[PDB]
Design a protein around this motif. Structure first.
Motif, mmCIF file in Angstrom:
data_model
loop_
_atom_site.group_PDB
_atom_site.id
_atom_site.type_symbol
_atom_site.label_atom_id
_atom_site.label_comp_id
_atom_site.label_asym_id
_atom_site.label_seq_id
_atom_site.Cartn_x
_atom_site.Cartn_y
_atom_site.Cartn_z
ATOM 1 N N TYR C 46 0.671 -1.212 -0.121
ATOM 2 C CA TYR C 46 -0.121 -0.054 0.021
ATOM 3 C C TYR C 46 0.923 1.167 -0.006
ATOM 4 C CZ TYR C 46 -3.952 2.646 1.148
ATOM 5 O OH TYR C 46 -5.029 3.830 0.699
ATOM 6 N N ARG C 48 0.747 4.354 0.995
ATOM 7 C CA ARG C 48 0.860 5.066 2.238
ATOM 8 C C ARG C 48 2.051 4.304 3.103
ATOM 9 N NH1 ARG C 48 -2.353 3.632 6.197
ATOM 10 N NH2 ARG C 48 -4.091 3.879 5.057
ATOM 11 N N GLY D 76 -5.827 9.818 3.481
ATOM 12 C CA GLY D 76 -7.151 9.632 4.258
ATOM 13 C C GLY D 76 -6.723 9.587 5.641
ATOM 14 N N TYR D 100 -12.384 1.724 10.637
ATOM 15 C CA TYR D 100 -11.312 1.367 9.694
ATOM 16 C C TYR D 100 -10.132 1.039 10.677
ATOM 17 C CZ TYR D 100 -7.156 2.101 6.946
ATOM 18 O OH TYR D 100 -6.120 1.779 6.236
ATOM 19 N N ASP D 172 -17.423 9.903 7.925
ATOM 20 C CA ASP D 172 -16.404 9.320 6.780
ATOM 21 C C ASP D 172 -17.442 8.712 5.807
ATOM 22 O OD1 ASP D 172 -14.607 7.797 5.268
ATOM 23 O OD2 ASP D 172 -13.428 7.022 6.765
ATOM 24 N N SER D 194 -11.496 9.196 2.072
ATOM 25 C CA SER D 194 -10.298 8.674 1.769
ATOM 26 C C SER D 194 -10.263 8.780 0.167
ATOM 27 C CB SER D 194 -9.957 7.590 2.242
ATOM 28 O OG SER D 194 -8.893 6.819 1.704
ATOM 29 N N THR D 196 -8.247 8.321 -1.933
ATOM 30 C CA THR D 196 -7.515 7.274 -2.497
ATOM 31 C C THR D 196 -8.344 6.145 -3.272
ATOM 32 O OG1 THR D 196 -5.908 7.297 -0.574
ATOM 33 C CG2 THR D 196 -5.692 5.478 -2.130
ATOM 34 N N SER D 324 -6.702 -1.437 -0.653
ATOM 35 C CA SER D 324 -7.289 -0.439 -1.149
ATOM 36 C C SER D 324 -8.353 -0.551 -1.850
ATOM 37 C CB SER D 324 -6.549 0.529 -2.137
ATOM 38 O OG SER D 324 -6.860 1.692 -2.183
ATOM 39 N N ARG D 342 -13.669 -9.793 1.155
ATOM 40 C CA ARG D 342 -14.068 -8.445 0.713
ATOM 41 C C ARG D 342 -13.710 -8.021 -0.675
ATOM 42 N NH1 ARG D 342 -11.141 -3.140 3.126
ATOM 43 N NH2 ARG D 342 -10.265 -3.411 0.961
#
Ligand SMILES: Cc1ncc(COP(=O)(O)O)c(CN[C@@H](CCC(=O)O)C(=O)O)c1O
Ligand SMILES: Cc1ncc(COP(=O)(O)O)c(CN[C@@H](CCC(=O)O)C(=O)O)c1O
Ligand SMILES: Cc1ncc(COP(=O)(O)O)c(CN[C@@H](CCC(=O)O)C(=O)O)c1O
Ligand SMILES: Cc1ncc(COP(=O)(O)O)c(CN[C@@H](CCC(=O)O)C(=O)O)c1O
Lengths: 359, 359, 364, 364
Positions: C46, C48, D76, D100, D172, D194, D196, D324, D342
């Protein structure tokens, strides 16, 4: 792969090294060699080959069902390299309604190089056969054209070029690879003004060339390296990035184009609407046989030059500018020409209607 | 303004709008028009003119004491547009030791366009006079050349081209505008492979063209717009950024070049060192009369091809690559050619000496 | 084994091992494919957490400062914030009295609510540092030379004081750059930079950098950077790498002009006091010369009043009236009293920079 | 007056008033010339404080969220950090239970030392929010739908609760994007993203965005952003502007595939539970549909165990195993139990995305 999946995963747009899901921007000029002539991954000099440029070239080669891709610094540069495939004394046939910059380069630059040009009304295929001289070596056709959207039969033009031994080229900028694939219809070389739809965001000046012929690709790779009209790595990435949403953008543009035309045909201040989707359009059925969509460039006529100046000022969402295929709608007078953006369809129809109502 | 102050404040490298002390990157393709044909600040289409590209063009025009500047997508593209100034049947005279890509484009591309070429040993000015045919229209000279660094008299070549009515062009890539200004010596057009020294960081493939002639600039602006070999905005900015340190970089390179040569002339494994700074070099005094510095490209000879392969592997700081003028030192075998970087002078001399000691 | 000028070119990893490119590829990306779940091709998951282009500039500043771990942040203030986050509620920080305004702002208006209580000390006398160490003191932050008066603080003694009292020593090395002053070699735990100044060098990148050899403090800084996300973008990371390549030649040219510009300022009658560590009468001039082999390009001097300072700036031709410093172009500003002018010597010709400021001072 | 799709193109200021350019120029700069001392040509003095390219993306998110002030951050998490910095030592924050991981990490490992004491609440039942309000509570932070289980929280009721107890409500809105859910219109003080994920949309920009209509809170956020410097670079700011242009078409394509993908997951025998707000049986399904006119592209479902989840990912062809979300390419990951998968539905062809995941689930 369906069209929308091809635009995302077609070609090579990832990094095998780090696994990055987007192409790295290789802002570089040269590459380390482990031994003399031993290239690590086949790169020695960015002008000859650049990994970011090689990515966008593999994208256009896949979207057009071609084997080789070539990225140039502009659509005019891509067309120049194609014309340099011919020698002194060769002859080219183009449609009489080519884009202005094509008319300029061929009649003002390449005529000084012995290349003889002849512009022909290609909307009737019989006029292409008769003009073929013994020195004729190329057939260049845009469809639909700029700015009257004249449709030329691609398939018949390919069979014609094949029978008479001609390199067939098609300027597929207006239709994009999402709705038209000239290579699939027998055409030898297809090129695009990537500044228009493929980039899609009015921020890249580029040209692309695709072909399934190994010879013409070898000759084109030599011309590109020997003339250096190459596309930069930063512009190559933004081209790849914008192509990702090409399918979604063209479908939104196509939805608005249908509604905008319906409005233009019923307005009393608008005579002569030009678009291949209109039934009365010349070669209308030919366009549908070679394309499963429509371009976002529409041309219509107002009363005179002052009405066109008034129509543009009254609009709120149409941008008076000199390109096409943008996310934002563009308007210009070459008769008015509009490039439909991806704004709300109801907003674009209403904005142009209330502006025409003031005439 | 002295040379080091000119590199910082020459041309237009700031934003009059916001006051930004660096040129904004205009990643754009088109510009809004307030009225029909009313350009806000003279920009309508990025291919015709782009503010970031116009910045780098004003920098090279000032550094060469010229009036007009032109930025191209590569050094080969800049040379192509210059050759397109001539028509079918015209003749060009070049030095016999031109760079390979110049030899390729003129003998493989432009000969197919009726342009006749003839390569001449320009180190003796008498050989330029005799070769001038009635159809001769151009004189193209690089000095010092690649890779043997042959020096051609620029001033005499300018007077020759003037007397016989020739467009004088000089490839000033090796010397840069910091040490050589061909326009100040009567030359009509000067061009650079901006990939080399002007960029200076091995991350931009570009070409630049400068001239004080309004005609040749008008004809060059038309060729650039009609062939589209333009430089991108991102590459244009990095070119401006790298040019800022051109003076400091060349002075460090010049300091190392002096010490490296002294080492090469005294080593027993090195025969034939080639550089315009050597006294026994042909036309050595001519180079000093037309230049106040030296290039960082040096060429020397080892015993055979295997010794050159061994010399390269033993080095630690020299990068085996195919460019020149980088901050990092580069080495290649076209006889070995090195492009001196900006590393420590003692380190570069010692690294090449201990590598030659292993032969 | 490499000298300084060679270290600026080949220090760290600024090439592509894949294609062989001689510059760092700009990885404008956010995530990375995994062949197997948990298997990283080259250690990236990632952007970041870690980005290949940012990792390049991080290894550069770590090599230039003789450190083990480098960190790139979105700005110089972000680098200072992340370092201040090393401390807990109730902890204390000792800073120099004339710390940069933004740091003063961050430490007295933001981190005073973290529970950190800040103390500003005349660190030019190391005794004032020892006198101010409270029980709950945990960090020693020092700017040398400071801004805009360029006060010089003993780095070696400040490191011994922090070590003796168990404090984390941090040095803002923005003005001196790693080309002239290496705090880590003098016993300092953490060194930070405002890369916007000299490391970038072309006034086109806003970035911060941090370097340290402490493995424990590096893991704590990597966690804070990931847990707060003040990271540097890949485009800015590359331009920072690109600008650092010419750092030595830029500073050496800036120093040459600094010598002549100071001599002019000391002999002009419209100039009273001139502040720079190179001046022999400058406080702790011997200290600076013992801990650094060069000089910063920021010079501070005084004119009669504020009207004279205003007319001076309008009288120059090569000095750009703007904020920031360390750029290739010379910069001027008026920050501390009305007549205090601050210049940032660029890389223009020395004769041109001295003549332009001399004639401008002469219209006073 | 503009519809959503037109707002994405002409909302905010994304053109150059100088040259007329139809896109925002990338101001790769750090400082700006001043004609007179204190006179700003167009209101810019230092890129950290304000940058023209960053100001463009800031006006975009402010217009898309029907807010007055926008702020762009380096990531973010930086946007979340700056918002948490609005509070002082001792203040309390109420967050949803399944916030998160990075926010949980930042709030429990960094800001617990600020003096902020954090509380994680099952915000799906608004009574649990009222029950948790301590005297020293000052902020209400909620993710809806959450990650990765996509729990839905009542935004309108959460705003009324924050207003009633004098709390700063923050939402958020990363998963829903401004194209489907506008928290500011529902009474929320601050909305963050975020960028991203979906706003960037092409998995090439790590950025954070904040929007609010409160003038007081905006001045406090602008100060923190300048005093901590977690700003977004100009290159990333432009790519964020560029990616937002296609936000509507991307989400509308993602939603179409979300409908068909869920139907496939509900009828597959190797899939047990499927988590998404569109499902009628999903908790607070009526709440989501009343506060949003769309659906996020993140879907969570369960397979038999962890070996089945591993084999599934190796069996897909268009789902990229990476972190991401919200990219044009479909993404897959395994975050909460072993079998919980996910996905982030991309913009590939709907038939291709449904057939590829259906056949992959069938090798189980
Ligand atoms: C069909 C077609 N071919 C070639 C080109 C030129 O490719 P470039 O990438 O722009 O070099 C254009 C763009 N013509 C634009 C711009 C016309 C102009 O600037 O004068 C257009 O038609 O609006 C085009 O529409
Ligand atoms: C004198 C000269 N002219 C023209 C060029 C070509 O300009 P470009 O910007 O590279 O298009 C070069 C670069 N020649 C390089 C690269 C040679 C090669 O790649 O084969 C060189 O000589 O090393 C050059 O050195
Ligand atoms: C010593 C020092 N530390 C930290 C910083 C801040 O790092 P940034 O990269 O700028 O975030 C600066 C820059 N001070 C500049 C900026 C002044 C201002 O922003 O108002 C200066 O003093 O000219 C600095 O000089
Ligand atoms: C709802 C939400 N808030 C905040 C963030 C973090 O903002 P950044 O721009 O990434 O700094 C994310 C991204 N969460 C991603 C990243 C996971 C990771 O970094 O390990 C995700 O859950 O896939 C998120 O999904």
């Amino acid at each position: 792969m369906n069209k929308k999946t091809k635009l995302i995963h077609g070609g090579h747009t990832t990094d095998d090294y780090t696994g990055a899901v987007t192409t790295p921007i290789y802002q570089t000029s040269t590459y380390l060699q482990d031994d003399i002539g031993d290239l690590r991954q086949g790169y020695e000099y960015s002008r000859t080959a650049n990994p970011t440029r090689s990515s966008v070239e593999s994208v256009i080669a896949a979207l057009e069902n071609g084997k080789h891709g070539f990225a140039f610094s502009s659509g005019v540069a891509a067309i120049s390299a194609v014309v340099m495939l011919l020698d002194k004394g060769d002859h080219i046939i183009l449609n009489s309604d080519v884009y202005g910059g094509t008319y300029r380069a061929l009649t003002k630059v390449f005529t000084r190089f012995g290349i003889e040009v002849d512009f022909v009304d290609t909307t009737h295929t019989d006029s292409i056969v008769q003009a073929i001289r013994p020195t004729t070596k190329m057939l260049f056709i845009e469809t639909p054209s700029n700015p009257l959207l004249r449709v030329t039969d691609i398939k018949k033009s390919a069979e014609i070029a094949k029978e008479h031994g001609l390199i067939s080229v098609v300027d597929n900028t207006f239709m994009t690879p999402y709705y038209q694939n000239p290579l699939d219809l027998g055409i030898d070389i297809v090129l695009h003004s990537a500044t228009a739809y493929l980039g899609g965001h009015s921020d890249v000046v580029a040209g692309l060339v695709a072909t399934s012929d190994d010879k013409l690709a070898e000759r084109l790779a030599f011309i590109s390296n020997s003339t250096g009209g190459i596309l930069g790595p930063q512009d190559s990435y933004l081209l790849v990035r914008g192509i990702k949403t090409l399918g979604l953008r063209m479908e939104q543009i196509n939805r608005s184009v249908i509604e905008i035309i319906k409005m233009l045909q019923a307005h009393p201040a608008v005579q002569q609407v030009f678009h291949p989707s209109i039934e009365s359009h010349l070669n209308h059925d030919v366009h549908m046989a070679q394309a499963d969509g429509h371009t976002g460039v529409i041309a219509f006529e107002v009363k005179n030059t002052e009405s066109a100046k008034q129509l543009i000022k009254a609009t709120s969402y149409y941008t008076l500018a000199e390109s096409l295929g943008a996310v934002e709608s563009l308007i210009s007078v070459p008769l008015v020409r509009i490039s439909v953006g991806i704004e709300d369809t109801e907003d674009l129809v209403d904005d142009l209607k209330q502006a025409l109502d003031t005439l």
